[PDB]
Amino acid sequence: SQEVMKNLSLNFGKALDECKKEMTLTDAINEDFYNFWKEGYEIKNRETGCAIMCLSTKLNMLDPEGNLHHGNAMEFAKKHGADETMAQQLIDIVHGCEKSTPANDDKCIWTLGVATCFKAEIHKLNWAPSMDVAVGEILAEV
Template sequence: MVCSQPRGSTASQDIMKNLTKGFGKMLDACKNELNLGDHIIQDFYNYWKEEYALVNRDVGCAIICMAAKHDLITDDMKLHHGNTHEFAKSHGADDEVAKQIVAMIHDCETSHASNNDDCSKTLEIAKCFRTKIHELKWAPSMEDIIEEIMTDI
């Protein structure tokens, strides 16, 4: 089997950077749609920083909005596995990495299933996912994320 992506954390960091950038393209639309303050942008800039405390419920609401715009969640607010797999692949993940990303999000979703507040639950899922990505050393560097964002402005 020939893999299209080189193995290792650098390739995976690039994939996560591409996923973050692609997913984040909807942030401004969701910020306006949900009437969220500029603080939401700061939370997303700092998302990959392990030491950054994600405590704002609005982040969860914004993630729901962005995920919905990318067709990554179902009507009952659960991860759409097929669409999420394809989203990951369209941002540079090979089949194996895309499956791993979906599995990690699903595990986080399952561990927070008892939370009935969709925005709070989504915030907890996002924090869980961030932890799993850091454990794999896949988190993109803040410098890369900021550079990508500044290039788009």
């Protein structure tokens, strides 16, 4: 067996530890990014949008086996039991959430808008991706 398959499979730690230097962000991000997901929590600040928008092109960091590619997460989704039509749902939502979100002068704050909208459409679906899928896919896209 292995016993390094804990909650959150994706190696966000190292990837974020680069993106914090790439954009020269705050350091709060190394919680604040994960914290975005927490219940009762309003993460309506720029740098979590930046973390997303910078991470979206760091799949090569998250993904150790080199499965997850920019605009190709279908197989990765199936590693977590999200089939074609489950991925397509989330993908219609990503490109759907670009719409409802006003095209912000700040790509970070736009991107957090899109990733706010996404979660709320998952709440209209009848199922619930693992976050490694949902987060993994909007990163493969945005």
